[PDB]
Amino acid sequence: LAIHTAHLIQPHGLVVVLQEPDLTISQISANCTGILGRSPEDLLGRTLGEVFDSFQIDPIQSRLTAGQISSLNPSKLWARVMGDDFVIFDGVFHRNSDGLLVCELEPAYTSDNLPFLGFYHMARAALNRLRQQANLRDFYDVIVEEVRRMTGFDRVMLHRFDENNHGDVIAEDKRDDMEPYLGLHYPESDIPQPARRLFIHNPIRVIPDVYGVAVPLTPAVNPSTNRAVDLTESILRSAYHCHLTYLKNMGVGASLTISLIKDGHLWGLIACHHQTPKVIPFELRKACEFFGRVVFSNISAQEDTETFDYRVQLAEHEAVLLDKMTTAADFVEGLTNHPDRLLGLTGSQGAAICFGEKLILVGETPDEKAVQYLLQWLENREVQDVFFTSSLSQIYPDAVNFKSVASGLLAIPIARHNFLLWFRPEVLQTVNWGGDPELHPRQSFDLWKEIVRLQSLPWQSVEIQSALALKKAIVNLILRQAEE
Amino acid sequence: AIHTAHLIQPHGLVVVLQEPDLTISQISANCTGILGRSPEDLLGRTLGEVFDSFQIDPIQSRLTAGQISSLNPSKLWARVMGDDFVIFDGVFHRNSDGLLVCELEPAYTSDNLPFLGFYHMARAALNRLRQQANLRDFYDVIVEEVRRMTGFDRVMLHRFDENNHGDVIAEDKRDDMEPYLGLHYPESDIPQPARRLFIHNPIRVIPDVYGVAVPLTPAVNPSTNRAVDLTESILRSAYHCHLTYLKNMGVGASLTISLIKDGHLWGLIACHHQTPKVIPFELRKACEFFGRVVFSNISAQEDTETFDYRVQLAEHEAVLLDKMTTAADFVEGLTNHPDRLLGLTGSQGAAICFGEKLILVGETPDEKAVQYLLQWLENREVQDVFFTSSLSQIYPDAVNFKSVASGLLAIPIARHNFLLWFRPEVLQTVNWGGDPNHAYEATQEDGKIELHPRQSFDLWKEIVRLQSLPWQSVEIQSALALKKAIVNLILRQAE
Ligand SMILES: *[C@H](C)[C@H]1/C(=C/c2[nH]c(/C=C3N=C(/C=C4\NC(=O)C(CC)=C4C)C(C)=C\3CCC(=O)O)c(CCC(=O)O)c2C)NC(=O)[C@@H]1C
Ligand SMILES: *[C@H](C)[C@H]1/C(=C/c2[nH]c(/C=C3N=C(/C=C4\NC(=O)C(CC)=C4C)C(C)=C\3CCC(=O)O)c(CCC(=O)O)c2C)NC(=O)[C@@H]1C
């Protein structure tokens, strides 16, 4: 039933389209009858000034309004509705991709005492707590905790993205009684690349009533465009029923989502859920926007420093291996006497050393027969620098059999036939999520699981370079030995 | 300057490899002195032949950047005429022109050095940094720990301001070396080329400042009939202009680490040595990675502090909106909390012309000059808000009170009423005082200080006269908020 071509409006706010240069309402959201007590037929054709009874809005007239909008962007228009209640609205003007003038009106009130300053004071105090954390875990756990405190959502969670753009719920705070989603991985597909790239322009997604019935504009077709309006710019853009389904059968009544953007690419989300509907005012969205920026700034700081700590540990292995490789009469015998360090050098779980005729297996590797066949294959490939794959099963079909040990392989040709190999198993650390058994998280997880079949963790650049460093070091040692 | 005569620092060799045969099309002229074999001898030979090092199996076409990047670095060694057995670090890039280049820095041993020491100190540096309260303390630690890790006679931290003029924000040096801390240099002292180059080439090493630069022979690459672009080289010699600067500064070796945010150069870690001091591939790569994470924490600290301004400005906004409506006169509310009023736009003075009356707060010009100024503002017919970093530039009379109101932010009120904030010229926020008091340097104005820090400071000084600190976005919006509030207090004071 529900069409995918739904650029409609979440029903709590109004969208109006202003004709130029006359500044009359060319189209309006259909909920205007309820919200303004006046029908679309009544309002169609009226200038904004005449609708808002205070004539609050003073749009200085122009043939075209350009960047004058930026001035009007924080506007608090109000008009009397019922018993002279004088309902107020936060107003925000955009130019749609079609090039029309659009104004969005979210009803506002200052009933929430300490509405914005409070949030701001808690936010700085969050940032002090955050910066004083040692562990990155503790660090993440604090983000969600303090966001949830600040915001008051029934659930707040931190989503990061895999190197395949998949998902990983890396932190979470929720009611004791709610189901935990921590560790749940989900497919990249669950948030399509449009919605992602759209977070760059629209950094916050608010759905304060999930069950709210989306309303169109009337007339639906802009007169000038003879084409529908593009709500890409709107906060009130209604979300696609696909996702609402997901939320509904997850038990969600209101969402908030803060994008975490690095250098223009989406790093992760702060995804907030409420079981009850729950509105978030302009004021507090603006503050959330700014908070998420700085929160992410500290995220990327922590993430960066930790990933430099990997480079130290890999240097550590590199050094211990360079030492003991030259100590023991056979260099190979040095490597195999410190296998912890050898596997550690590329963050692998197994390895093989074919030097001349001999061949040594270390850690978790395939049976020697299957390995030998593999080496054979690699010399046929005639790899010049290095071979590495996150999914070996795809390129060497026979490796489907030992997917569980070597789905991932990195191999470096020491010589024409002498090679060094590192093996990774398919992702088995997914135990983090229950795996509990029709489009709901448990399904998404099962789908993600299907995708990661035959597939190891990705070979990080630092790991590869640290293996190349060992290869070149070995070659040089052998040359010196001959020269010796 | 423009001509960019592409020469080489003389300690290392640059070769240009023809493809697909990997023969040397061009070589640096120092090859005679360093390899004991002449350019005539070496030109045409494959690299493998010269350095007894595995010549890459002759590529199907050209060396893919995978093959090029896996090669980096490679240790090449050769015996040459006279028993000479010499080790080089080799490092391959392809030019913007596409041609392949290899640079050979003489090295001490054959086997790799993982810089474990450096890495252990770096790890420990980052723990120190994360535990720092003040941003100053924070910066001061960077330089200190870099200097420890690296062992330079001097390390300093340069941050660029909103026009890219330099500011030496931190520094660690030998006790009896001259301090450059607080020095501000004009953006010109690092030309926009060198800057835009740091985003692609993050590290600059000049281990011999006095070394005589050598060219390639032939100078003209046969494949381009064009001289060769060394932009991508480590061994690219720096322009004599800058070497002069270093020489007259007493430098024997320089290292520089770019600090890049969002693809724009934020600042430098500029390292100086009195003696020559080389930095190997290995240790550059470690430095490169260190500077990234160091900067990552810098931008984290910088960001959080600048959002602390947003909270404090919200705080002023709220207290001012409260007390403005409490006291019967809104003006009387503003003047009872002047700390908060100046604080709202991070200014040092303010003026309130409502109707007839006019109230000066903090540091402002004399009433006569202010009154003339208000007059001027009505003539401007300011629509939303007026703000300028240098008022003296557009209102000439303001040259007189430059030292109080070089910067002005004004919000007009109808009936000729106005709110003003004043900022002083930025000459007292920073007082490096490189010239001894009123040094009579002008006497004997032969530009003797040509290419000298002091000169740069005097140049920068000339640029920043008549000029306040820039009006930050947050500050303007906080003032607009007060404008809207005042308009809505005039409306509610209907009487
Ligand atoms: C439809 C066939 C597919 C689809 C489309 C779709 N998804 C989104 C947006 C989001 N989806 C998620 C996913 C999750 N949120 C959670 O809390 C969890 C459990 C931990 C998951 C898996 C998220 C975070 C978003 C964006 C954030 C938000 O709540 O706004 C959209 C865009 C909707 C819009 O217009 O903003 C679309 C179109 N989702 C599916 O599940 C199908 C595979
Ligand atoms: C020549 C007419 C002008 C000029 C050109 C120029 N400068 C650079 C590079 C740098 N200049 C500096 C400046 C300083 N370094 C310091 O230590 C200090 C004192 C605190 C100053 C003022 C710096 C940091 C650099 C870049 C870092 C480095 O050492 O590499 C270049 C580029 C040289 C190259 O090819 O890499 C050029 C062409 N410099 C002048 O002083 C003239 C105004």
Numbering used by the authors:
A (entry chain B): 18 to 454, 468 to 514
B (entry chain A): 19 to 513
Sentences from the paper on this structure:
In this work, we have addressed both issues on the basis of the crystal structure of the Y176H variant of the Cph1 photosensory module as Pr. Protomer A was modeled contiguously, whereas residues 453–465 (chain B), 73–80 (chain C), and 452–465 (chain D) could not be modeled due to sparse electron densities, probably reflecting local disorder. Thus, the overall PCB geometry was modeled as ZZZssa following the NMR and RR spectroscopic data as discussed in the following sections. Whereas the interactions of conserved Arg222 and Arg254 with the B-ring propionate are similar to those of the WT Pr (A-conformation), a drastic change is observed at the Tyr → His mutated 176 site and its neighbor Tyr203, corresponding to the Pfr-characteristic B-conformation. Even though the resolution of 3.7 Å is modest, refinement with the Pr-like A-conformation in this region resulted in substantial difference signals. The B-conformation involves concerted changes at Asp185, Leu201, His202, and finally, a “tryptophan swap”,2 where the space occupied by Trp450 in WT Pr is replaced by Trp478 and Phe475 in Y176H. Pfr-like structural features of Y176H also include the interaction between conserved Asp207 of the PASDIP motif and Ser474 of the PRxSF motif. By contrast, WT Pr showed widespread resonance splitting. These results suggest that the overall rigidity of the Pr chromophore in the binding pocket is greatly enhanced by the Y176H mutation. Thus, Y176H represents a mixture of a Pr-like chromophore configuration with a Pfr-like protein structure.
